[PDB]
Amino acid sequence: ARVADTISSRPTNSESIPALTAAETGHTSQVVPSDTMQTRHVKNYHSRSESSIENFLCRSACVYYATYTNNSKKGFAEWVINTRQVAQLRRKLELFTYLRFDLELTFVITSAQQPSTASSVDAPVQTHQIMYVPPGGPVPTKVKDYAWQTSTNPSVFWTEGNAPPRMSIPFISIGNAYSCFYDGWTQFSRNGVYGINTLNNMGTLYMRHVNEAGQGPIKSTVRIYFKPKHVKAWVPRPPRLCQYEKQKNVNFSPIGVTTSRTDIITT
Amino acid sequence: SDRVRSITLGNSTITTQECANVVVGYGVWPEYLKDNEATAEDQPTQPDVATCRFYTLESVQWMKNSAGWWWKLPDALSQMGLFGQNMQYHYLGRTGYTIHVQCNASKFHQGCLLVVCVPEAEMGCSNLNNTPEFSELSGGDSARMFTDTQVGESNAKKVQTAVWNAGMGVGVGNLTIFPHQWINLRTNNSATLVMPYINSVPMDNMFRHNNLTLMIIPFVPLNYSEGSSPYVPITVTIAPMCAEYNGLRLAS
Amino acid sequence: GLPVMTTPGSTQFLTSDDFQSPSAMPQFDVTPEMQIPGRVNNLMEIAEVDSVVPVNNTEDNVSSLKAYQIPVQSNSDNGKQVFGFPLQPGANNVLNRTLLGEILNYYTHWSGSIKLTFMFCGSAMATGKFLLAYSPPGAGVPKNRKDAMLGTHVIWDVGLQSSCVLCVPWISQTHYRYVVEDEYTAAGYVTCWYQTNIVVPADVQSSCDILCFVSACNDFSVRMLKDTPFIRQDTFYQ
């Protein structure tokens, strides 16, 4: 994807004006710097390869992290899957209105020892289980439950010390594209919830320890990294200026346009 | 010349003596649904003369200390002719629009409007924990208007009407990426857009999803000397194009 | 029993890698595509759309729509200065928050020309001439019209066509330039001066306004993607 080069020019005196246009027509002028001045013949070998939608978006970014404690009943984490709880990924996915991508999902699971009181503590390697419940399935309510069989739900099992686990998710949606924005209600009588939260029904993500509480409590932490592949993007959008406020909606407190300088002639 | 147009749709005609060239969509003209893209199994109803005509919305007065206006687009035509009587009886619906904003002044007035057509515009509530109701988001063929101050957090459910953030949280100057056209009273006199159907589903319900929003924001305000006519109105005429509907049910 | 030998780099998690991965839902069928208008294939189609740049920052106009209007009136002397700002599209707070300057804050290097479309938002009888000058660095800011007429300039005459495009060239020692503030690769200044006055007839308001746009030419390039410094977060959104 090589960019265009400037062609040579000569001093002119003619009735053709490339500089003057009419910006009222909603059409940006296509002038080249060989039309307003004299130029030479340079050839550009510059490439526009690192600004396509593929290379701009295919990079891993954290979206949530949850902690859970071993020595506890109902010590297990859960997360309703949505990508609107960080600020550095929510700003990239709200540059376009409709997206369509296949994920590549990676977890980085760590551990930390809690201040126990038993003497000569020694714990072996730990195993974690990450179950994905689709919208409508059975949910667990404690650590040793019947719902952790994964009879049809996908799940991974990971011992500590190895490489981090990684799956790949295809395009799981009802319509033809993921819609990052939605201006409309859920009920047909136009009440209830309003916004983007009526479109998000993607499931839940449950995590737990497989080992039992031996002698010392162990608190873990799991960070979740999304990575879109084969991305197509439609209908671009001006980026967000104000700070983000909530997860469910597009609320804000008003902010000035830019920062201020001291004059109009100052540099 | 390249300054006069004449648009004919149905049984109505919009002529003009000086206006700029038309801004058509993101490049594509509005057309009917294909066969390899459809998802409904029952045959659509395409009247094509009973809906595709120019409906004239209400006129708003451009003052000197005015802020802006917005019309939510498949909501403003809910009581207009046989387009508002096909929206109530049918479940789905698919339309493309042809917006035409017109505001005239003499050679001694000055000002500048920005006529943009923003798709899927969510508005932010005043108190940050709630969402705005229906009556504060859009009125039946009546313009809701911005302000030049900030709506406080004391109000429960009202739309934030700060014009310099355009209600959505973007900068107001960055709205020129959407299809837009300026009305400059020095040269221009009216600005016309043609908008295709931009949505992620091939057909959509029309009473709970407003997929376009027409915004008018004055960047350089109106100003005149003492003696000229002080009442300058703005009238918007909006026509559907290539409409079809499925799923006939009761009145709703 | 093929003998392998695992090189360094094993069992690491690099956040910009290109590998294959086992699919989690096998034999899934996707929803077929649809011709949605306005497909963007490259981010240099968003940067080539013009956007209004807020020149008039005076500490009480940024919280208004008065930040976009550069005020122009009828003078009594000649050769005054309408505005002026240095041309750093990722660090200067004039060009910081436009449509061009926000895509440029994700990247670190840039090269190419920059168009600057002006528009005269005045009356129908008022005329005037403006001199849009651009001076490459090495000296200071130009102070007079006699000093700013030496650089690249274009003399705009208002009339029926009411918008003029000054296209700044690419005059630089390096192939690219830094987005951040670096004085080794300074890029120059952009000024604008009264050529003749603004002459109006009777019963016309003498104070006219001017809008200014900014976009990139057909040879813009960016490189070395980074993260933006404008967004911020302390707690999770919930």
Epitope: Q243, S253, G256, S260 | N127, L128 | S63, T235, Y237
Partner: antibody, heavy 117, light 106 residues
């Protein structure tokens, strides 16, 4: 990032007093800055906030007439001016920088304002 | 205005300490707990019903749903002798609860 208020001050009944909350370590013109009053025998009470980028203030319904919040973007301070001082307003005044939704993350250390004769 | 009802609690070192504050109507999980040191420095502890702030030791834990919520310190230390407020964020204006001071048993 830290917020540094002024010293403890003193005023007569009927005079006016002006506190300060010098924000440092971040960009002052982006976040709103609130003011919280704690009487020494009760719990915390809210007064009202100020948007430093647009100078739009909004007080509580009980302190609407007494307080007058103001700020300047240059020296990056936020002022609070009390008027018509009675013997009810002898308390400790904190300033807080309201992060994302409703969470007062960074607090000051608080000035003790007392009235006497 | 939502009335936030929470007085002077006592517990020994290294025990399970529980504080509870009750709102007027359902505030829908929007409760934050603060901690005021005896010198006068205030800091945010738990910014949801359960989610801990970054920089807080893992002794503190929260719970609750609907109207009644709680804060639980599962092992009391010497640094955690302070005053704890609860604050809602559901209805303007933001109203704080009364204090709750901790002290040693005997």
């Amino acid at each position: 990032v830290q917020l540094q208020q002024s010293a403890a001050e003193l005023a007569r009944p009927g005079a006016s007093v002006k506190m300060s909350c010098k924000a440092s370590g971040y960009t002052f013109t982006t976040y709103t800055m609130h003011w919280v009053k704690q009487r020494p025998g009760q719990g915390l009470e809210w007064i009202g906030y100020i948007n430093p980028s647009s100078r739009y203030t909004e007080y509580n319904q009980k302190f609407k007439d007494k307080t007058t919040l103001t700020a300047d973007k240059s020296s990056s301070t936020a002022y609070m001016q009390l008027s018509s001082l009675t013997f009810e307003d002898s308390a400790v005044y904190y300033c807080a920088r309201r992060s994302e939704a409703d969470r007062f993350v960074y607090w000051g250390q608080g000035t003790l304002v007392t009235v006497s004769a | 205005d939502i009335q936030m009802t929470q007085s002077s609690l006592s517990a020994s070192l290294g025990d399970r300490v529980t504080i509870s504050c009750r709102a007027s109507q359902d505030i829908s999980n929007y409760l934050n707990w603060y901690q005021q040191k005896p010198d006068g420095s205030v800091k945010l502890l738990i910014y949801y019903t359960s989610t801990l702030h970054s920089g807080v030791p893992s002794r503190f834990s929260g719970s609750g749903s609907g109207t009644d919520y709680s804060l639980t310190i599962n092992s009391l230390e010497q640094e955690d002798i302070a005053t704890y407020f609860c604050q809602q964020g559901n209805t303007f204006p933001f109203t704080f609860g009364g204090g709750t001071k901790l002290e040693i048993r005997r």
